Amino acid sequence: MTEYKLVVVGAGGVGKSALTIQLIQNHFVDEYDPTIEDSYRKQVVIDGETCLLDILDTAGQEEYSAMRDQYMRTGEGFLCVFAINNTKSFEDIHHYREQIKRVKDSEDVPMVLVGNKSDLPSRTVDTKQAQDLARSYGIPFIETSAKTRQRVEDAFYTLVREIRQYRLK
C-alpha cells in the first residue's frame, strides 16, 4: 500500500469540493458551503498498486495563511483547478503555482492543470490556451466535469502518476 497526499487548489467556485466529493462519495453537490475544508482518505488501485489517497479539499485561498503554508508543505501533489467559463480563475493559476513552488523551494512539484465545468457550453477559456499553459509548466492538462463525472478519476489518478514518477527523479 502506498500513500499519496493530494491537495486541491483553485479560485472559489471552480469546483474543488464538487470534484473531491464526486471522487470519494460518487455524487454531485449543487451548493456546497464554500468555507468547508476537509481531508478525505480512500484506497484505490492504480497501475496495479493499492494506493491510499489522502486528499485535502481546500477552502480559503489566502496568500497569508500559516495553515495553507503547512498543507503545501505536507501535500505531495497539487490539482490546480480553474473553470472553463471563468477566465479570472484561469489567470489565478499562475499565482497558485508560484505559491507552491515557493513553499517547496523546488521546481520539481507534481501538479495537474484541471479545467473543470466542461459540461458548460459557454466556454471562455480555449482548450488550446490551457494546453499551452500546461506545456509551459511541464504538467498534464485534463478537462473534467464534476457534474457528469467526466475524467474525475483520471484527474486524480494522473496526479498520483506524476507523484510516483517524481519519486524516481
Ligand SMILES: Nc1nc2c(ncn2[C@@H]2O[C@H](COP(=O)(O)OP(=O)(O)O)[C@@H](O)[C@H]2O)c(=O)[nH]1
Ligand atoms: N455545471 C457544473 N457546475 C459545477 C461543476 N463543478 C462544480 N459546479 C458548481 O459550481 C459551484 C461551485 O462548486 P464548489 O465545488 O462548491 O466550488 P469550490 O469553491 O471550488 O469548492 C457549485 O454550484 C457546483 O454545483 C461542473 O463540473 N459543472
Ligand SMILES: O=S(=O)(Nc1nc2cccc(Cl)c2s1)c1ccccc1O
Ligand atoms: O495536513 S494533513 O495531513 N491533514 C489535514 N486535514 C485537514 C482538515 C481540515 C483542514 C485542514 Cl487545513 C486540514 S490538513 C494533509 C495535507 C495535505 C494533503 C492531505 C492531508 O491529509
Ligand SMILES: [Mg+2]
Ligand atoms: Mg469548496
